Write a protein that binds this ligand. Structure first.
Ligand SMILES: *[C@H]1O[C@H]1CO[C@H]1O[C@H](CO)[C@@H](O)[C@H](O)[C@H]1O
Length: 486
């Protein structure tokens, strides 16, 4: 009985499944595409629920019309639904096809208070997302950012209650930064970063500067400042005193700064997830966050690009198990990426190790008792990609008589298009879905969710950081799947 081996497959919808005008105007095309996904046995779809579309008029002027039409279409297809609370701009990150900013009235606050945006050491403001520094600052016609997020999720729940109760909506992914990912905007590909640059620390907004000053003073170092030996976006580690082998990242001051920077990201997730949990209490959903896959520089001691993204990950410090430990009280899932990547596919100069990074994140999640899901990072249609995903989905292969020791809770494919669902691309995709399902038919009843319980007791940052060390080896992963596409 191989049923416990089944891994759900979801497909991301187009970025503008709902138009830039908050209208559902491509429904017939989408319906036709969904028929192809259903022919393939897909479990469900994932979609961005864009803040700038729904709350675009003004505070609390929520317009759910288009999303309700979309969700009805997905329900009528027999598909489940993962909804992303997309508190970010579409545009400016890799693959973005369509341009959907955060609400204009939110951005208007930035005219008198430009520090509502993550800011780099050059002073450049990133307008894609609100700095975590204003999470609890009542700057937006009386509301804080966290209040805005909570109110949006409340309105979503109220409006979408019938889809929750019908078992259509089964996952809520809480967007926590740029591109929905819990990270800083350290690699701005349209404003002066190119892969595989180390990126920059994006902590110069006045709210984060004041928080650092306060943190430094609390430990008797009021004079400490952010590191200034960090180079710039397109450097490599050895170009800098901070990130070079044996560099100043290892120093007392460096460690304190990196802990501060990465801890703030963890705190940002914890506080928003607590609100999300209160909103969705009692519904049969799971709450998820998305962690970005910063595979470049993983092979060098400084893990420089992870560090600037906000993941304080080193040979001897597990910067993902800390995040996982924070998720535990919420019973939140990790959704990761890079599931399709092999190390041999990466350029040498990127010092890139996606396989090992994936193994680390999955292992960290599993050690904290979490459900772990994953996406592909880049568009792929070929058997090798699918076989890499399959390996990651069941790292120990098939258990012939029960559930395997570890498995992904789900996989989400980026992304639906007409190209996916024709020709050879479609044939490859269908076979992949069969293999993910352990060659079983689609099971509409799989992985049932209990009513969401309230988050457990808040734990301190010190408690969360006990997960950082000792760093543990990953669980063993097979080199190749035992159930390839063929
Ligand atoms: C950052 O794995 C990357 C995913 O980001 C892209 O897809 C997301 C889901 O559709 C979307 O929210 C994001 O804006 C886009 O860049």
């Amino acid at each position: 009985n191989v049923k416990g081996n089944y891994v759900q497959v979801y497909v991301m919808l187009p970025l503008d499944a709902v138009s830039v005008n908050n209208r559902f105007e491509k429904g017939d095309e989408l319906r036709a595409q969904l028929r192809k996904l259903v022919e393939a046995g897909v479990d469900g779809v994932m979609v961005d629920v864009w803040w700038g579309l729904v709350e675009g008029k003004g505070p609390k002027a929520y317009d759910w019309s288009a999303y309700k039409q979309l969700f009805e279409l997905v329900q009528k297809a027999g598909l489940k639904l993962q909804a992303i609370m997309s508190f970010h701009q579409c545009g400016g990150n890799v693959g973005d096809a369509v341009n959907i900013p955060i609400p204009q009235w939110v951005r208007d606050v930035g005219t008198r208070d430009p520090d509502i945006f993550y800011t780099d050491g050059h002073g450049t403001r990133n307008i894609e997302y609100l700095t975590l520094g204003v999470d609890n600052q009542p700057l937006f016609h009386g509301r804080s950012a966290v209040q805005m997020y909570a109110d949006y999720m409340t309105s979503f729940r109220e409006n979408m209650k019938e889809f929750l109760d019908a078992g259509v909506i089964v996952d809520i992914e809480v967007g926590l930064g740029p591109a929905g990912e819990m990270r800083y905007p350290s690699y701005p590909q349209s404003h002066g970063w190119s892969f595989p640059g180390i990126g920059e620390f994006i902590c110069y907004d006045k709210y984060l500067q004041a928080d650092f000053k306060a943190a430094a003073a609390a430990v008797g170092h009021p004079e400490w400042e952010f590191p200034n030996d960090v180079g710039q976006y397109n450097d490599t580690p050895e170009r800098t005193q901070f990130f070079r082998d044996n560099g100043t990242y290892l120093s007392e001051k460096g460690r304190f700064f990196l802990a501060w920077y990465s801890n703030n990201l963890i705190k940002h997730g914890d506080r928003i997830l607590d609100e999300a949990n209160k909103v969705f209490l009692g519904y049969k959903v799971q709450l998820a966050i998305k962690i970005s896959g910063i595979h470049w520089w993983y092979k060098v001691p400084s893990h420089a690009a992870e560090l600037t993204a906000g993941y304080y990950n080193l040979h001897d410090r597990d910067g993902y198990r800390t995040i996982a430990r924070m998720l535990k009280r919420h019973r939140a899932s990790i959704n990761f990426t890079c599931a399709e990547m092999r190390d041999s596919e990466q350029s040498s100069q990127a010092m890139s190790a996606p396989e090992e990074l994936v193994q680390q994140v999955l292992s960290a999640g599993w050690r904290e008792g979490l459900n772990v899901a994953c996406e592909n990072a880049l568009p792929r249609y070929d058997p090798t990609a699918y076989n890499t995903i399959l390996r990651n989905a069941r790292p120990h292969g098939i258990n012939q008589s029960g559930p395997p020791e570890h498995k992904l809770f789900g996989f989400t494919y980026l992304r639906l298009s007409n190209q996916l669902v024709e020709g050879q691309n479609y044939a490859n995709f269908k076979t992949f879905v069969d293999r993910m399902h352990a060659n079983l038919p689609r099971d509409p009843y799989v992985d049932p969710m209990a009513p969401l319980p309230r988050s457990g007791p808040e734990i301190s940052i010190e408690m969360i950081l006990q997960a950082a060390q000792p760093k543990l080896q990953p669980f063993p992963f097979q080199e190749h799947t035992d159930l390839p596409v063929g």
